[PDB]
Amino acid sequence: NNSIAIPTNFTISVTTEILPVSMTKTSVDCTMYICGDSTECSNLLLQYGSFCTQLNRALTGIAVEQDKNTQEVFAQVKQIYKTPPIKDFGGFNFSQILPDPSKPSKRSFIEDLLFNKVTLADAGFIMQYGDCLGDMAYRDLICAQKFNGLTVLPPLLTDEMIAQYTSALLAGTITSGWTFGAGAALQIPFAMQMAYRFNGIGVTQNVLYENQKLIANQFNSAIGKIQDSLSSTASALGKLQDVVNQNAQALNTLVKQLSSNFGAISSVLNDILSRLDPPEAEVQIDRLITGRLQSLQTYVTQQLIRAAEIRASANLAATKMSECVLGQSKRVDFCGKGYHLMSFPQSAPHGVVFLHVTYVPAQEKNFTTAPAICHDGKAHFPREGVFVSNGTHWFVTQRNFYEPQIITTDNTFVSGNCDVVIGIVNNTVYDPLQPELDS
Amino acid sequence: NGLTVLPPLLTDEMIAQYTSALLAGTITSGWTFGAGAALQIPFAMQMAYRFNGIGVTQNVLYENQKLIANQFNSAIGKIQDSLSSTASALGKLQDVV
Amino acid sequence: NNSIAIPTNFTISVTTEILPVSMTKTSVDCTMYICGDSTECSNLLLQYGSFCTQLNRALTGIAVEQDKNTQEVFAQVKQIYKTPPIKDFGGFNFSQIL
Amino acid sequence: QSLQTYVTQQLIRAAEIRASANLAATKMSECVLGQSKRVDFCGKGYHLM
Amino acid sequence: LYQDVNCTEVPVAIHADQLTPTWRVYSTGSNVFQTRAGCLIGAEHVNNSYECDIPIGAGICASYQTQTNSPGSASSVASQSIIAYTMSLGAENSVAYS
Structure with missing residues (x-):
């Protein structure tokens, strides 16, 4: 009942959260997939009618x-x-995560390392080696893989545009803070941005300045740790890789299903027509078409589930961006473990990455606390901060960090008597008025 | 017909242990343990900060602290009544099963 | 324009919310379900192929x-x-729920 | 066809359960671990714990 | 728009192979030029960029009038026609930071 723990030091930890946003845009045509340039097969397929039209609409x-x-x-x-053009932030260095002006492509260092950390090949010259793939290098374009018209519609938004959006948001956060998300951008020094954010989490900004430079280092080192997270853990991008693998496996399975017999004499329409007469082959063709239609329906249903998953992830990503990045969120464990300070967005192939800079206590010490202080019959409750004791003297310190100060009437007000409080203790409160009256 | 039911990875005892640990941290460490290292603090002093969070000065708490505790305790009893007077509390789980 | 309402007393109400988390983990095998220890049925079923493999993956x-x-x-x-080991909380009693 | 229908229904149930569990986890992070200022999110009335 | 294809196999007998590096494209200005995403007929590429009107892909958007949301006079029977252009990414801005 009389023991409390107060933090005496703090650390600036940074975490990463990968959130899928979109995926490959696929499309399947009924005609080519089911029927190969055969009039009879097309005529039979048109009997179903609206199935293909609704699948395309979906x-x-x-x-x-x-x-x-x-x-x-x-x-x-x-x-x-x-x-x-001049990078002055009071000690913070975002050049590691900011785009490199020298490189022709405006891609951050983090994205370059993410691409590099995947197993690539050395047999030849590395000129472009994958501009859209989810951190790999493969053979020729979709046309190489499109032997049945499995066209892959290019995404509306290009990676360069996503990177530009991420850079703009990051620059607004550094310069305009959260003001630009709530209206017109308002320039303010970065060193003064963290001051308000600490007060948001109940920490007085006075500490910030006293450790400003140090804090910057704590931030900088954290960025380095991110690199280690890539070397010591390859599962950070697990979500995007798993989604891509699932999509590729589904497409490949759908492709191989074209060769499925489905109980017919042969899996090729031309062979059936050549070896077997058309009129009796009608039943086999109908059965094959029905099987292919069932497979297409199953694939489309799976695609719907995947689309629902991706939209659900993207909604959370957008909510975090609005809250974690643009502003400051009071929600616990929403913008990363620990008290939220800010968040940085980064582009990722068919996804986004959030780096959450948070406030976490580092060193804690025990102290003896009392519910209040009532000296001359009138109680004295703390407006902000909790009373602490070292065993001999009683001091007042702020809520989330150790900063003892002499107890004065300015930081406390009178409410109740000695008797009303339970567990109260007696102490002297420094009254600034008293010394003045002495002279 | 081989309709195997794979046992859940997490056992009810582990879920109960997690719930007890979280409840104990809340009583002792408050919300500090969720934001970092746990920081012990009396429960009576935890409600003081929470009232200020909702714009209520903690001064009332102490003046009615014991009373508030009773108000809390009686509430637990009401939970039991909620089971006797209403069997639809677990409707979701029963319907899913 | 000149009337306000101020609370003079407060009460501590407690509610309950039940939220599903998981459910029974089920699994179905194509062979036993469709075919009973018959070679011909298994051979015919293998024609479909990847359907059972993808259902199991799902x-x-x-x-x-x-x-x-x-x-x-x-x-x-x-x-x-x-x-x-000592339950002292200034009046609160969590032993009912602990 | 029956197995496919059952699997589809199982997928819908799994999506429902995950949607419920995400809300439960969000409440646990907010309602239980911390104090949430969201109205009617952690129960009717001003949230205490 | 013929999508994910190149308008080369289409029947054309009016031009003879002149040994040109890129599909005999000799233009004085921003005249129609072949695009990798697809081959478009009925619009002329313009260097200037404006807000997207009809998204197509790879950041290419098509618009009818050669202006965006004019509070004044709209298009006419004049030389203005449908155009395809790279959508202007937001609006350029500068912040005085010190």
């Missing part, structure tokens, strides 16, 4: 919603912001 | 996500905390 809606999710996640500000 | 993914949901809901703290 696929188009899936693509539209996938594009809208990316637009909402990234395209949130009409105004593009840019960092100043 | 079921495994469902189980994995159901387990992960429980892990996230409950397994959030690596450190296990325990109440003190």
Whole structure:
């Protein structure tokens, strides 16, 4: 009942959260998939009718919603912001995560390391080696893989645009803070931004300045740890890799299903027509078409589930961006473990990454606390901060950090008597008025 | 017909232990353990900060601390009544099963 | 324009919310379900091929996500905390729920 | 066909359960571990714990 | 728009192979030029960039009038026609930071 723990030091930990946003845009044509340039097969297939028309509509809606999710996640500000030519932030160094002006491509160092950490090949010259794939290098374009018309519609938003949006948001956060998300951007020094954020979490900004430079180092070192997270853990991008693998496996399975017999004499329509007469082959063709239609329906249903999963992830990503990045969120464990300070967005292939800079206590010490102090019959409750004791003297310190100060009437007010409080203790309160009256 | 039911990875005892640990941290460490290292603090002093969080000065708490505790205790009893007077509290789980 | 309402007393109400987390983990085998120890039925069923393999993968993914949901809901703290042997809280009594 | 229908229903149930579990975890992070200022999120009335 | 294809196999007998690096494209300005995403007929590429009107892909959007949301006079029977252009990414801005 009389023991409390007060933090005497703090640390600035940084975590990473990968959130899928979109995925590959696929499309399947009934004619080519089911029938190979055969009039009879097309005539039989047209009997079903609206099935193919509704499947195409569902696929188009899936693509539209996938594009809208990316637009909402990234395209949130009409105004593009840019960092100043001189990088002065009071000690913070964002050049590691900011785009490199020298490189022709405006890609951050983190994305470059993410791409590099995947197993690549050395047989030849590394000129472009994958501009859209989810951190790999493969053979020729979709046309190489499109032997049945499995067209892959290019994403509406290009990686360069996503990177530009991420850079603009990051620059606004550094310069405009959270003001630009709530209206017109308002420039303010970065060193003064953390001051308000600490007060948001109940920590007086006075500590910040006293350790400002140090804090910057604590931030800088944290960025380095991110690199280690890539070397010591390859599962950070597990979500995107798993989604891509699942999509590829589903497409490949759908492709191989074309060769399934489904109980017919042969799996090729031309062979059936050549060896067997058309009229009696009608039943076999109908059965094959029915099987292929069932497989297509199953694939489309799975695609719908995947689209629902991706939209659900993208909505959370956008909510975090609005809260974690643009502003400061009071929700616990929503913007990363520990008290939230800010968040930095980063582009990722068919996904987004959030780096949450948070406030976490480092060193804690025990103290003896009392519910209040009542000296001359009138109680004295703390407006802000909790009373602490070292065993001989009683001091008042702020809520989330150790900063003892002499107890004065300025930081406390009178409410109740000695008797009303339970467990109260007696102490002297420094009254500034008293010394003045002495002279 | 081989309708195997794979046992859950987490056992009810582990779930109960997790719930007890979280409850104990809340009583002793408050919300500090969720934001970092646990920081012990009396429960009577935890409600003081929470009242200020909702714009209520903690001064009332102490003046009615014991009373408030009773108000809390009686509430637990009401929970039991909620089971006797209403069997639909667990409707979701029963319907799913 | 000149009337306000101020509370003179307060009450501590408690409510309950039941939220599903997981459910029974099921699995279905194509062979036994469709064919009873018959070679011809198995041969005919293997013609479809990847259907059963993808259904099993979907079921495994469902189980994995159901387990992960429980892990996230409950397994959030690596450190296990325990109440003190003496139950003193200034008047609160959690022994009913502890 | 029956197995496919059952698996589809199982997928819908799994999506329902995950949607419930995400809300439960969010409440645990907010309602239990910390104090939430959201109204009617952690029960009717001003949230205490 | 013929999508994910190149308008080369289409029947054309009016031009003879002149040994050109890129599909005999000799233009004085921003005249129609072949695109990798697809081959478009009925619009002319413009260097200037404006807000997206009809998204297509790879950041290419098509618009009818050669202006965006004019509070004044709209299009006419004049030389203005449908155009395809790279959508302007937001609006450029600068912040005085010190």
